[PDB]
Subunit: 83 residues, 4 copies
């Protein structure tokens, strides 16, 4: 929703990508550009992991009343995590 | 346990590693050696994924009677998956 | 420099991150958000790879006159690639 | 060749895989099994990296007399590294 910390994290990566575009415009050292691009990649990776973790924790902690349906829901969610 | 398919998969990788040792003894082309080592890596990765998936599915489908304790058990198990 | 295709690729990822921010604002399905974030991650990965490849190809094809210094230059560049 | 340290490293991983097979036979904790399998994966990854690095360093330091052919040889070798 509106104030979510994942919006803020991705807005940081968005701005960093703009900075990296300038580094390329300026023929900056490939190593600096790669370092910064790797940081953006790692930040995106971290957001993916935290979003999946939040989704699964919500699944677990907001169960369906039907315990059998809840198992199947959790199973669909975990095999998504692992893959 | 005794007849588990993951033992068999890892015994395949064990034998493949022996073959790769021979390729190195024989100064075989680095590309062939790397291809085979990558296959072993991928097989180990696959066993990791299937073992985690089995463990979490067993968690889900063999719950504790205490539903609150079961949630905490699943949560400990999923954050292990994601990380 | 000014018109580089890597600027354009990263500007695409920048815009996609803005779209993903909206998906989070809108509590869109985690799976859709993760799919899109993974695409951004993969695009950043691809830019990293192409920038390193370009840098090493330029190293190789614009050698120093001193062949021994050029070897050391290439070696510093390849161990950067592998790591 | 005969005494190569990469044979020894892979023989360590081979033996570790045998140990992990026993852990599975014994229904050891998934987390211990995964930790050990991850170590094997990381060791295989490290051997891949060191073998590629050695191959490229040998390319660089044992050039063809034909400098143009040597460039093409290095280029084929680096794009293999990056990919
Ligand atoms: Na949150
Ligand atoms: Na099994
Ligand atoms: Na270019
Ligand atoms: Na060696």
């Amino acid at each position: 929703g509106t104030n979510s910390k994942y919006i803020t994290a991705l807005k940081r990566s968005e701005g960093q990508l703009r900075g990296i575009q300038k580094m390329i415009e300026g023929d900056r050292d490939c190593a600096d550009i790669v370092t910064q691009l790797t940081a953006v990649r790692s930040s995106v990776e971290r957001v993916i992991e935290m979003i999946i973790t939040e989704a699964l924790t919500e699944c677990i902690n907001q169960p369906l009343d039907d315990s059998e349906a809840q198992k199947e829901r959790l199973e669909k969610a975990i095999r998504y995590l692992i893959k």
